[PDB]
């Protein structure tokens, strides 16, 4: 609970997003108006949930946490919409997973304010903004697209997490972890906790490169920050599908995982880092993937 930013001033990176949100947030506060609906979109672990809480906290209102999967019957959506107080934040994670039933009910709370509903701010979160229906998406006045963080930004988040956990760390070591965090704060912080564990067992005074390397070997994280499953995805494409192209459903079936967990959770970074590419016929691995995994380039 302690490593989560409580305000934008504590939120590292995402400069474009913070400037946009800050402008609208400060304005609404100064005018005492209800903030326009905000959509947060991007891969998991990038701080969407964190920003939702920061919004309510800055508006000095209450936040109601929920998700698309949870809201099954219109009754669920009703009970929540009626418990909202003026200016409250209704945070819906995985908002694109809302069934048409509760969806229509929620839309009616935007196009109007009764099913009476106290004026509130809808903050939705999704891994991909495009997953939302045309109608609902358009209802958002503010759309914030979160991209992966830079290595420098992640190193900053790491030093910050290390300090809060009462552990010293050398810059070179923080850099090494940042380079292996797959552009994600959540990943960087968890790696820092695991590296902290190594420091404890080896009885070191501070985290150095040696400690980080020992930890990465134990966690099976390579020099590109790829984990076991990341490599399984690339290896499966290379070996079973001859490098691709292979459709999403076929790859997911071969891997035994849901298509979403592949396209929304793991593929984003693999695409960004240049290990994978998407074509009309499906996914394909790149030469960088073959070389990194030590496979003879076909």
Ligand X SMILES: Nc1ncnc2c1ncn2[C@@H]1O[C@H](COP(=O)(O)OP(=O)(O)O)[C@@H](O)[C@H]1O
Q: Does 269 bind ligand X (CB under 6 A)?
A: no
Q: Which of 180, 186, 196, 283 binds ligand X (CB under 6 A)?
A: 186
Asked whether position 57 contacts ligand X by CB under 6 A, the answer is no
Closest by CA to 124, choosing from 147, 105, 97, 100, is 97
Q: Please, what is the minimum distance in Å from the beta carbon of residue 159 to ligand X?
A: 11
**Got the DSSP string for 31-90?**
HT-PPPPEEEESSTTSSHHHHHHHHHHHHT--EEEEETTT--SHHHHHHHHHTPPTT-EE
The stretch among 1-9, 62-70, 245-253, 277-285 that binds ligand X (CB under 6 A) is: 1-9
Query: Which residue, 112 or 197, is less far from ligand X as judged by CB?
Result: 197
d(CA 98, CA 261): 18
- Of 190, 188, 186, 194, nearest to 174 by C-alpha is 188
List residues with catalytic annotation.
Answer: 48-49, 93, 127, 186
Nearer to ligand X, 154 or 226 (CB): 154
Q: Looking only at residues 145 through 184 of this chain, which bind ligand X when binding is defined by CB under 6 A?
A: 157
If binding is defined by CB under 6 A, does position 46 make contact with ligand X? yes
Measured from each CB, the residue nearest to ligand X is 47
Interface characters, 115-134, with ligand X (x: CB under 6 A): ----------x---------
Residue number, 90 or 157, with CB nearest to ligand X: 157
Do residues 36 and 121 touch, judged by C-beta distance below 8 A? yes
Number of residues forming the site for ligand X (CB under 6 A) = 19
* Residue 218: C-alpha distances to residues 89, 176, 194, 215 (Å): 42, 15, 10, 5
CA distances from 174 to 60, 156, 224 (A): 35, 8, 15
Contact pattern for ligand X over residues 215 through 244, marking x by CB under 6 A: ------------------------------
DSSP 125-177: EES-GGGS-HHHHHT-SEEEE--PPPHHHHHHHHHHHHHHTT--B-HHHHHHH
Smaller CB distance to ligand X: residue 3 or 78? 3
Q: Which of 24, 36, 44, 257 binds ligand X (CB under 6 A)?
A: 44
**Backbone angles phi and psi of 282, in degrees to 5:** 130, -170
Which of 185, 225, 244, 245 is close enough to bind ligand X by CB under 6 A? 185
- Positions in the binding site for ligand X (CB under 6 A): 3-5, 11-14, 44-50, 125, 157, 185-186, 189
């Amino acid at each position: 609970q302690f490593l989560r930013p409580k305000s934008l001033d504590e939120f590292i990176g995402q400069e474009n997003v913070k400037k946009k949100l800050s402008l609208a947030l400060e304005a609404a506060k100064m005018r005492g108006e209800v903030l326009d609906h905000v959509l947060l979109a991007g891969p998991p672990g990038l701080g969407k949930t964190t920003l939702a809480h920061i919004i309510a906290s800055e508006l000095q209102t209450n936040i109601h946490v929920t998700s698309g999967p949870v809201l099954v019957k219109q009754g669920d959506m009703a009970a929540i919409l009626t418990s909202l107080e003026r200016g409250d934040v209704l945070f819906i994670d995985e908002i694109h997973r809302l069934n048409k039933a509760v969806e229509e009910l929620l839309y009616s709370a935007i196009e109007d304010f009764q099913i009476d509903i106290q004026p509130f701010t809808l903050v939705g979160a999704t891994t991909r903004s495009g997953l939302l229906s045309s109608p609902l998406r358009s209802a958002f006045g503010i759309i914030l697209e979160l991209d992966f963080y830079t290595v420098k930004e992640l190193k900053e988040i790491i030093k910050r997490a290390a300090s809060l956990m009462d552990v010293e760390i050398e810059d070179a070591a923080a850099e090494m972890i940042a380079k292996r965090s797959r552009g994600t704060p959540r990943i960087a912080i968890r790696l820092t906790k695991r590296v902290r564990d190594m420091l404890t067992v080896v009885k070191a005074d501070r985290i150095n490169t040696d400690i980080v390397l020992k930890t990465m070997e134990v966690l099976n994280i390579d020099d590109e920050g790829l984990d076991e499953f990341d490599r399984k995805i690339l290896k499966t494409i290379i070996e079973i599908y001859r490098g691709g192209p292979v459709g999403l459903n076929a790859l997911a079936a071969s891997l035994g995982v849901e298509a979403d967990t592949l396209s929304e959770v793991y593929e984003p970074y693999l695409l960004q880092a240049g290990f994978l590419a998407r074509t009309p016929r499906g996914r394909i691995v790149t030469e960088k993937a073959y070389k990194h995994l030590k496979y003879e380039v076909p």
